[PDB]
Amino acid sequence: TYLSTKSIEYYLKELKEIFSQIWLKPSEIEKRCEELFKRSKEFDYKRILVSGETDNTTLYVIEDSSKIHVFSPNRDLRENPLLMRWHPSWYEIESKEIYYKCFLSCEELYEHLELPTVTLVNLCVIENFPIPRLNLSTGTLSSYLRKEQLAKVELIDMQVGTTINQIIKNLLDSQPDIIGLSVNFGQKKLAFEILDLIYSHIENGDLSSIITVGNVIPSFSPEQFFERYPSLLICDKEGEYTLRDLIKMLKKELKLDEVNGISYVDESGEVKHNVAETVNFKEEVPTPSLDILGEISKFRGALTLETSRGCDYSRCTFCPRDHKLRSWRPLSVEQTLKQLDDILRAGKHFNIKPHIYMADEEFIGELPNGTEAQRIIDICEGLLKREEKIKFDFAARADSVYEPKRTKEWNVERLKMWHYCALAGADRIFIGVESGSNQQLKRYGKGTTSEQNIIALRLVSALGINLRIGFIMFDQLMKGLDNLKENLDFLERTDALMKPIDIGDMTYEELYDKLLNDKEFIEKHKTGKPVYTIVSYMLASMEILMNTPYSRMVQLTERKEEVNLIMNDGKPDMNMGRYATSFVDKTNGNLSEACQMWIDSNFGVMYTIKSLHKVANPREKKKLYSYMETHREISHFLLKYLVYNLSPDKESQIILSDFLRMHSMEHIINVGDGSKENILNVMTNWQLIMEKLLRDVEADLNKGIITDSEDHRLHNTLKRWFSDMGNWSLI
Structure with a gap:
């Protein structure tokens, strides 16, 4: 008993509509496919599988192991990579493009359809400067695996606020064959906490998963991970071929020392580095998976x-x-x-x-x-x-x-x-x-x-x-x-x-x-x-x-x-990979440290000004922005004023004189002394210009030109700043 041409073309038209909603998670696509074949009750089926992505999304309707329907409304089935791995000549010498095919008594194809499960965890925060942006890079690893129809892939992205406990519960519930951690810059300590919990549940017999960690920024050493997680696999930022080979290993098509791009500890206790073939990005990596958009729908940004x-x-x-x-x-x-x-x-x-x-x-x-x-x-x-x-x-x-x-x-x-x-x-x-x-x-x-x-x-x-x-x-x-x-x-x-x-x-x-x-x-x-x-x-x-x-x-x-x-x-920073380095020139190190203290001394007031600026009305917005413009201006010539006191020249004298006259501060401590003591005296002198600016801010706040927060944050930080003038005893 075959399907009519009308039923095939009806199914293809409806699946093309369902597959067009590329923001839907795979399970949501499967549910809409279940509803399609149930509402038009033509045949009973035992299992449903959706794989592929965007323009190659494929539905498998498993009536039985011996009768498998395959629908590919957007691409020729002859190019299906799963069928190609099962029987690369299943289409024989058919010269036309095939969009539907019913495979009869193909028991091996049913085994190919029992795809492995991968869970990708994106340890990534939403960058806010200059504007918020939602990072979709980890979605290319999932979309590659889906396009190749190599695995069912679940995405957990912490950009939407998913907590550690929620991640752990998700992993234990889904029981994935492979867990992939993407560690963005500055998330190494968070990765250590998450890997601690994962491995506790593995030792407890709650979870058995291959664990791979990929660092976006190679500011680390693998021994930092192997010391704590001796069985962990460390892979490259581009993990497409790594996950492909690990899935091959699970299907017993590859040994561990044949897996692309992993670094690991073998049975002898030595670190083994496997070869890393360069990923053919141009031809094999499709549009990043967009599962994340439904999880944060009111995102505004890039x-x-x-x-x-x-x-x-x-x-x-x-x-x-x-x-x-x-x-x-x-x-x-x-x-x-x-x-x-x-x-x-x-x-x-x-x-x-x-x-x-x-x-x-x-x-x-x-x-x-x-x-x-x-x-x-x-x-x-x-x-x-x-x-x-x-x-x-x-x-x-x-x-x-x-x-x-x-x-x-x-x-x-x-x-x-x-x-x-x-x-x-x-x-x-x-x-x-x-x-x-x-x-x-x-x-x-x-x-x-x-x-x-x-x-x-x-x-x-x-x-x-x-x-x-x-x-x-x-x-x-x-x-x-x-x-x-x-x-x-x-x-x-x-x-x-x-x-x-x-x-x-x-x-x-x-x-x-x-x-x-x-x-x-x-x-x-x-x-x-x-x-x-x-x-x-x-x-x-x-x-x-x-x-x-x-x-x-x-x-x-x-x-x-x-x-x-x-x-x-x-020993560098264990979370970031940054060395603590001194300046080879003592005077330059004192200047750099002086500028960092300058930033720290102004952070309270200027951060309150910036946060008020984000919410102010247009008129106060322009006033608060002039504060920030002057702050940047004063901060720039602070260094020129420091350098001038350490090494004066004719032109820097004229420039600083014009700047000081513009601010009605023509006045304003040893010369040529690059010691910490003298540099502080020069900076405490230049801090008086910053005071004039904050006196304008204080005056505008008292005149009501600027509106303060409910908790009077600008009033407090201004009062604290005026008290802490000089007094660089806060390093």
Whole structure:
């Protein structure tokens, strides 16, 4: 007894409707499939299985082991990877595409349908700066396994607030064959607590699961885990092939020492490292699973997508890295647009406004024949053809905008590429300037110059892109104050940030040449604001992590100079992987420590101002924002004032004099003394300018111009700040 063609096409049409709701969890899809075949009661069946994802989602209706219906409304069944592994020539020489097939007396296929179970736990918080973003990276591991139909995958993501006890209860209830922990930056201690509970339930006989832990940032050593969890498997950030091979091992198709990308302890007590084949991201990794959207439906912010994996770690010496090189692998233009449309359509279902965060380590990249810019342009043209416009954020190196070592034609094509990004909705973009000193840029490995950074900021800002930069002022290997003075001059330049320029009448080559060579064009379109206005974190000091070339450079300086820089005997932070490192230059270490105390001394008041700013009405919003602008301004020239007291020069005297006159503080302790005692005296002097600002804040709060919280937080923190002037006895 066969199904009629009408019943097949009816089932295919309804399943295509059910499968279109890609925000539904697999169990919710299965329930809607059960309702479909029950409401039209044609045949009795024993089991239902849904696998695949988006455009290859597949339903298996198991009447019996000897009669299995397979529905694939979105893709040719001949491409089904599960059937291919069972019997790769089941379709013989059929030349037409197959969307329904009933397998009769195929007892081995029934065994293939008893898929293993994987539970992925994402230890990840929602990043809030500059805007909230929901990380979807762990969903690619699930979507790979679903697309390959290798396992039933459950996602537990702590971004929605799932507690530790809830995670444990979920694991014990689901009893998965494999548990995968994704450890994001700063969640290593949380992973240790969760692994403690998991292994207690394993020793207690409540749970038997293979456990893998993947660290997003390799600022760790595997021995930190093996010491406490000797049976744990440590895998790569890209765990697709690792989970594939572990599922093969469960089906007794592979031995443990054949599993891709795992590091483990064998029976001899030694650490074994298995080979790690590079994941074919472009061809095998589909749209990230969107199970998380239903768990947090009122999220407002950006949704993350990785349009490529890999990067060039040789351009960042403070970025941790593995011993294995990770090549840059982009999605095709068409597949990038497909995944974007999937995420945008799913976000629209939950009233999430179209805002994508490109989580790529290297978004623009580099291809043969310089076609990487054409990929970005083609993706932008795809976005321009949609009905609803989007915002999208991403990060980029300064030499991805402007590179004097390349031809002028190459740079003009890059300017065109960035323009298409602006047209397609590029919103907040992060440029990794990191320094304005050519020496410090080399220690950072950026391969870039100070002037090149200025021009890169000039080109991007002129296109209307909201810009912010990272900037690491102090680093431990710096000797002398020359690099600090170069950074201050860089950060004070007002010929970098351009207003959004109307370029409808120009060519890209005209705009390029005018922005680089026409001083009159540059003066006309500048915003007048200095570079430091777009620095993410002011007065930042280098934090050295494990497995970074900068840490190696530091260790080598300890050797060839016979000095101790890395403290705590070399033991780094167990949660973060950060070394406690002293500055090789004592004066620079005192300045860095002085700036950290400055931040700590102002944190109470300025954090209250910022939190009030988020909720104030438009008029108070503008007043509270001027407070923050002045605070950043005062914080910048604090370091210039410190450096000036340690090494005066003619120009820094004129600049500080103009600044002091602007604030009616022309007045305002030894000269050249870089001791902790003198630096504090210079800072306590400059703290008087900060007092003038907070007197305006105090006056506006008493006039009622600014509204305080219910608990009078601004009033208390102001009163405490005024009492604690000087008094740096809080370190």
